[PDB]
RNA sequence: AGAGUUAAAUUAUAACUAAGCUGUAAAAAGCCCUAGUUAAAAUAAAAUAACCCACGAAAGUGACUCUAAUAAUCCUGACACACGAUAGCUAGGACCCAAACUGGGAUUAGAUACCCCACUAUGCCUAGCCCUAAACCCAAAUAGUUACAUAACAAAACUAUUCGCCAGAGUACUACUCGCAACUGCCUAAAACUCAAAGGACUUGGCGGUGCUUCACAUCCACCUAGAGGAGCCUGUUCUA
RNA sequence: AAAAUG
């Protein structure tokens, strides 16, 4: 249910955290 | 005596932080929950250690002592006369309360009332 | 025949007697069961070990000295070498909550000693050492 | 009962008492109507789920020549009327 | 450590009973906690598990109690029916 | 399947009738096992009255049968205590004097021990625990054990012997061992109890 | 918020005994300067009481003692002021034990994971920062009512004065601005473009390597018998031709 | 304990 929306919410946070890190 | 349940739940009136947090409604069922089974266990393994003894000290022989191997049956019969008789007898009655299909039928007589 | 559990402290003026000893000078059984070894050694009053016997020292193995089987007969072994050095009576005193826990307590009894009393001195910190982390994250 | 607060006298250590005024002036008009049913060639059918004096009501409507039913009560008994009893039935007129 | 031994938590043997004496033994430590608290501090459990498990155990507590008030106050209607037939 | 529920098992033995007034709690069974208007199965060919023929040696011949071929079975027992018999009277005329009070001339009897010396104490069942099997020490049931016993010697006389040997004498070669305890299938029997007696810590995993 | 103290366990350290200790469903690795018992400072944490529900504005607080002490003759109110769990940063001190990371050993086709062992940052004290949480009891503050009245579930439906927010979903706890001891950061916070949906509760099936009771009678195991898969032949398929 | 995909 709304973990779905919590899981886009996490996925977009972690891939932005890994961009961050990389560039 | 049953504990106090005043200012423990998270309500409109509460004013305070909630103490207890049901899983599930605390409303009281008009049934009780089936009776468990009691998870079995090996017999007499201290009676097969003294059998197994006769066995390593005399080199694997039933001629030299002849007690420890008649108990090990022995043991063998009361525990499938045990697995046999008590399988009814301890469904039947439990010596303490009622059967839980008593206590069903006894809770449908009088049932709670969460509405009206 | 008034008999109390309560132990017989050296502060009393009691009359109670096992082959001729006090309570005082009975010897102890220390027995730590653990969840994977349980030890015993026979220490006496004087605190001078008299037998020591574990399911380690007893041929076992990995997972096979875990269970009370192994228990029993270290219990064996032990009472076996205590009877060596003449010993009677002793108090057992059981350190932890394991499997081998009751199993190499009787284990005394089938090795020929006589428990008169039984000492539960598990370590219960209150609120010490923080123990590992919890298994099956 | 919530509803039942005008209808009681007052509360005696606990134990709730009902004022036998309103009692008797309900009782008046109710054996008034049930009289006149009667008169008017009306059924009369005594419900009653209560198993320590059912056999009193059966006896009661016996007598009286009106009908009773004190026993488990059907689903469709008053409303599926034309299955559960017959084809073509008369409704009963006044419920006790 | 600091405390004299042999006081606490000791049973004595009666007539050379030794495996009634560890039941007795064990029931003390039971109806005192002492085997579950063991059983919980093998390993470290987190405040916010302690919480929920304290709280579980609070409502299951409550119920079970309630439900065995409820049980011996319908103690009295287990007689046999005498208006069977009815 | 063709024999209802109601039907009950038969009884042989003659002394069972013939002395009914010696007893009153015997007394009180069968005046109620024909009261009861109880149907009772038909007797099968295979066991009679006869007082030369023993529970265990109709065992042995039914389990010896390949196919349906009775009477070979039969004859094969026939042979067997014959062979025995003249291997021990053979052995008996060679003896001196102190010999013959203890040599035994009697098949049945030295079958029967040769079958308890070869009886196994306890047997081993393959528990599945953690995805492995373990050979978990049971005791078995009288039954069982005699069977293990009977079948142990069927299978070692089928395959470990000559072809120019026949099945009466080689089983009775391994009779008169097994009598002594020193046939092959007490060597089987005391490979079964090593066994369990190595793995007698893995006796946990049971739970009955 | 300061100052002082420690009951149990644990350990550095000595003495007797043993060759094993730890470890899991089972093992291996590790330690044999190991293990049990008798004595033992320093550090960390504070069984039962607690089936108690108190204090504080919130975060938060329940080993003991002492001092200071818990605003408002009591409405709401910020971008202003002061706090703000854990995690993280700097300097000094502490380090029993636990543990990110890491190195070994298990399992797996792979396992840089769950399982076992050792250890570091860290959790500890003082000073200075960082200002984030599912910071949730997802229910704003102040005085009230049980009148009308159940979308569904859940903690029943609502008044009077206010403050802060809410304009489809993804983009997006994003880019660009301002400010901040924060420089892989925090707060505020879009647009281009894509779609006609995105969402909350519920009913019934189906499933569940969720859990609990009764079972399997040729049936799953425990167990019995005779066979297939090995050879030749017959015959039926898939392949080449 | 173990155990992926359609
Ligand atoms: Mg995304
Ligand atoms: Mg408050
Ligand atoms: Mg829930
Ligand atoms: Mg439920
Ligand atoms: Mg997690
Ligand atoms: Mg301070
Ligand atoms: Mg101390
Ligand atoms: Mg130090
Ligand atoms: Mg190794
Ligand atoms: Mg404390
Ligand atoms: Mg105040
Ligand atoms: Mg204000
Ligand atoms: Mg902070
Ligand atoms: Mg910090
Ligand atoms: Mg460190
Ligand atoms: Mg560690
Ligand atoms: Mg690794
Ligand atoms: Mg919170
Ligand atoms: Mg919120
Ligand atoms: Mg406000
Ligand atoms: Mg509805
Ligand atoms: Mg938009
Ligand atoms: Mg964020
Ligand atoms: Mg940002
Ligand atoms: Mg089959
Ligand atoms: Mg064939
Ligand atoms: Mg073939
Ligand atoms: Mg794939």
Known sequence: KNILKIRRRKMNHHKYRKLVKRT | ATPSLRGRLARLGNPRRPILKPNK???????????????????????????????????????????????????????????????????????????????????????????? | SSFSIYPPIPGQENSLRWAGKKFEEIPIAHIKASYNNTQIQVVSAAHQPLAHASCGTEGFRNAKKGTGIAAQTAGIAAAAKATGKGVTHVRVVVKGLGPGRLSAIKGLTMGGLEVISITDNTPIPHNGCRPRKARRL | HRFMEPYLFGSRLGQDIIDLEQT?????????????????????????????????????????????????????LLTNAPLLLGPGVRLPDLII | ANHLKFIARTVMVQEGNVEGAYRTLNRILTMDGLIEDIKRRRY???????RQRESYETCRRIYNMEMARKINFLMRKNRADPWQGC | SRYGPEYK???????????????????????????????????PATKTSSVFEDPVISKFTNMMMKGGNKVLARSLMTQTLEAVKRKQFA??????????????????????????????????????????????????????????????MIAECREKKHRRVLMPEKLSQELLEAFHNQGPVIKRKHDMHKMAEANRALAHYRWW
């Open chain 2, 25 to 116: 409604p605390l409303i009281l069922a008009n049934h009780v929950g089936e009776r468990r089974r009691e998870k079995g266990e090996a017999t007499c393994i201290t009676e097969m250690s003294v059998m197994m003894a006769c066995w390593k000290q005399n080199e694997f022989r039933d001629e030299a002592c002849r007690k420890e191997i008649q108990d090990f049956f022995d043991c063998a019969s009361r525990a499938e006369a045990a697995r046999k008789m008590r399988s009814i007898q301890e469904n039947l009655g439990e010596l303490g309360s009622l059967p839980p299909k008593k206590l069903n039928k006894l809770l449908h007589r009088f049932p709670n009332k969460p509405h009206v």
């Open chain 4, 24 to 76: 008797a002036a309900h009782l008046q008009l109710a054996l008034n109507f049930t009289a006149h049913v009667a008169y008017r060639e009306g059924i009369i059918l005594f419900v009653s789920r209560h198993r320590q004096f059912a056999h009193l009501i059966e006896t009661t409507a016996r007598d009286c020549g009106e009908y009773a039913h004190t026993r488990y009560f059907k689903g469709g």
């Open chain 5, 44 to 50: 470290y459990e987190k405040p916010c598990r302690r």
């Open chain 6, 9 to 43: 098992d038969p009884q042989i033995d003659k002394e069972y009738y013939r002395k009914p007034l010696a007893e009153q709690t015997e007394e009180e069974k069968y005046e109620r096992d024909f009261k009861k208007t109880q149907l009772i199965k038909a007797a």
């Open chain 6, 91 to 152: 052995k008996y005329h060679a003896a001196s004097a102190e010999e013959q009070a203890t040599i035994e001339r009697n098949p049945y009897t030295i079958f029967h021990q040769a079958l308890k010396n070869c009886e196994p104490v306890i047997g081993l069942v393959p528990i599945l625990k953690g995805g492995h099997f373990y050979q978990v020490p049971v005791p078995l049931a009288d039954r069982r054990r005699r069977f293990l016993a009977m079948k142990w």
